[PDB]
Ligand binder design. Structure first.
Ligand SMILES: Nc1ncnc2c1ncn2[C@@H]1O[C@H](COP(=O)(O)OP(=O)(O)O)[C@@H](O)[C@H]1O
Ligand SMILES: Nc1ncnc2c1ncn2[C@@H]1O[C@H](COP(=O)(O)OP(=O)(O)O)[C@@H](O)[C@H]1O
Ligand SMILES: [Mg+2]
Ligand SMILES: [Mg+2]
Length: 515
């Protein structure tokens, strides 16, 4: 194999092949972290001269090395400066330590297209313009970075993981704004871990596979549907590569309705006031042995609702009268345990750690066994997320509450967590409520849905748990995106704006198919 593009050093990480870039199209990239996705972006953006796994140190070398490839001309243009790709960086948290002043100052400066007013609208930046960069949240930094990139005038735009820190509405609206670039004839390359967003965004897909931290390989370009389906199946036909020993199928959105579950508990109208913000919860019922997905933009009260159910927060009005044990995986986790992951988890339930079912369905797929000897206080955000999810699912309780388990996880880890939640809840016949912004995770794990509506920071309303179709129709109408079903894998499939299916579904008010 002589498709070696870059080696980080002796025994360091090596990248094989590169994705294609095409004007007028969106090329999506999907794969586990540590496999070279950002490295390819750096190379194509001109930020890193690939050494071709040798000593190459010039663009001329790359130009000769890519003879016979459509990228030869690309690199010629890159070296000559006829193109200067715009890059929305992955590590938006580092923006402050390099930029100062008001957001409106950063954006006016990036504005080379006179679309400031439009981009601000799309990314909900109206109240961030006057804010200083130093006071921005990870979420606001992400949206400001996507806006800066969208405002530039160039031919090539590369977005590295734009959905991180964005709520469900924000990530789908940013995807619409990003895709518009290709409609204007520009070329877009986007790396994404949220499969629904990746789907809606892309015309072409590359799957990246390999061994995290050791090597990564870009697949041949694939049509959007075929690429995402091969990814779920764990097997790339043409390349004849099986990167996962099993398939992840989504077929199972119908049986989760034909079964009369008993009621676990009911809760009455609840109100939680935080100064000027107010959350009103409509009376609801929770069934034994079901999973309720919870969706809604942020700053609306999802976490506040979960906290009241977990008993960590008290309602201002209304009273919950339960005699249930609850296991709770909080949205923001702070490691504070002097001991290893194994010590922490073995103290929760050692019998489950030694259980074949738990090792197969939870510990191995989430990579927990490989973290057993790690000190909890030294875990990264993604490692801590997996360990906290496992810690929560290892507890013995009537109800399990998981507040945003997909944050910090890569696409493969998300699929592993979706399966773990579903399989363990089915096994233990218990109940869970899961707040999530990742549509395919919601789809995979949920039997019913609770939708939150309101004005972020001002007021929120928790609608009672309803069917998947009714809840997604309610949420999606607010965003103008429709999903149908893909028979091959059973996954929800995004319709491009204006397509035949999109028009048909919108006219009928059926924004989300299951059947
Ligand atoms: N500057 C560097 N020096 C050495 N190794 C690096 C450097 N940048 C990235 N790597 C390593 O290369 C691998 C792939 O990195 P990256 O392209 O950022 O992955 P991803 O698919 O998560 O975006 C990782 O194992 C990473 O630690
Ligand atoms: N303890 C608190 N004191 C004051 N305001 C709070 C408190 N907890 C949450 N809030 C505010 O309540 C609103 C709802 O927050 P939250 O429930 O975290 O939202 P989300 O839907 O993003 O999980 C936000 O505007 C938040 O700033
Ligand atoms: Mg990356
Ligand atoms: Mg929250």
């Amino acid at each position: 194999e002589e498709d070696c593009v870059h080696r980080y050093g002796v025994n360091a990480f090596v990248l094989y092949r590169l994705p294609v870039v095409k004007e007028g199209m969106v090329v999506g990239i999907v794969g586990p972290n540590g496999t070279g996705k950002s490295t390819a972006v750096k190379i194509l953006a001109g930020q890193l001269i690939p050494n071709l796994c040798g000593d190459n140190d010039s663009w001329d070398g790359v130009i000769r090395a890519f003879r016979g490839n459509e990228l030869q001309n690309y690199f010629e243009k890159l070296k000559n400066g006829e193109i200067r790709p715009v890059v929305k960086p992955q590590y938006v948290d580092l923006i402050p330590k390099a930029v100062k002043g008001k957001v409106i100052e950063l954006l006016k400066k990036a504005d080379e297209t006179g679309k400031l007013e439009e981009v601000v609208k799309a990314l909900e930046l109206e109240n961030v313009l006057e804010r200083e960069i130093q006071h921005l949240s990870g979420g606001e930094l992400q949206r400001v970075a996507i806006a800066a990139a969208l405002l530039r005038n160039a031919t090539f735009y590369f977005f590295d993981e734009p959905s991180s820190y964005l709520d469900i509405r924000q990530r789908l609206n940013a995807a619409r704004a990003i895709r518009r670039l290709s409609e204007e004839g520009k070329s877009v390359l986007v790396v994404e871990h949220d499969l629904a967003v990746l789907d809606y965004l892309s015309d072409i897909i590359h799957v990246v596979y390999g061994e995290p931290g050791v090597y990564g390989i870009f697949s041949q370009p694939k049509g959007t549907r075929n690429g995402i389906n091969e990814f779920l199946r764990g097997y790339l036909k043409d390349e004849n590569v099986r990167f996962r020993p099993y398939e992840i199928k989504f077929t199972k959105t119908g049986e989760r309705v034909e079964i009369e579950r008993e009621t676990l508990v009911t809760y009455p109208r609840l109100v939680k006031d935080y100064g000027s913000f107010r959350l009103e919860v409509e009376p609801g019922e929770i069934k034994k042995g079901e999973v309720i997905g919870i969706v809604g933009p942020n700053g609306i009260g999802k976490t506040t609702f979960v906290k009241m159910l977990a008993g960590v927060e008290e309602p201002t009005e209304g009273k919950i009268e339960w005699d249930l044990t609850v296991a709770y995986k909080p949205q923001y986790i702070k490691a504070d345990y002097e001991g290893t992951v194994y010590e922490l988890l073995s103290k929760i339930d050692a019998s489950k750690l030694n259980s074949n079912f738990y090792k197969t369905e939870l510990l191995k797929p989430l990579g927990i066994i490989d973290l057993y000897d790690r000190e909890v206080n030294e875990l990264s955000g993604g490692e801590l997320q997996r360990v906290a999810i496992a810690a929560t699912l290892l507890r013995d309780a009537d109800i399990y509450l998981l507040d945003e388990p997909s944050a910090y996880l890569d696409v493969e880890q998300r699929l592993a967590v979706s399966r773990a939640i579903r399989h363990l809840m089915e096994k233990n016949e218990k109940t869970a409520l899961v707040v999530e912004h990742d549509v395919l995770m919601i789809d995979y794990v949920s039997d019913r849905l609770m939708v939150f509506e309101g004005e972020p920071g001002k007021y929120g309303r928790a609608l009672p748990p309803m069917g998947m179709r009714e809840g997604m129709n309610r949420f999606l109408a607010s965003i103008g995106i429709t999903f149908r079903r893909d028979p091959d894998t059973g996954r929800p499939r995004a319709n491009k704006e204006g397509s035949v299916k999109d028009r048909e579904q919108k006219e009928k008010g059926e924004y989300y198919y299951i059947a």
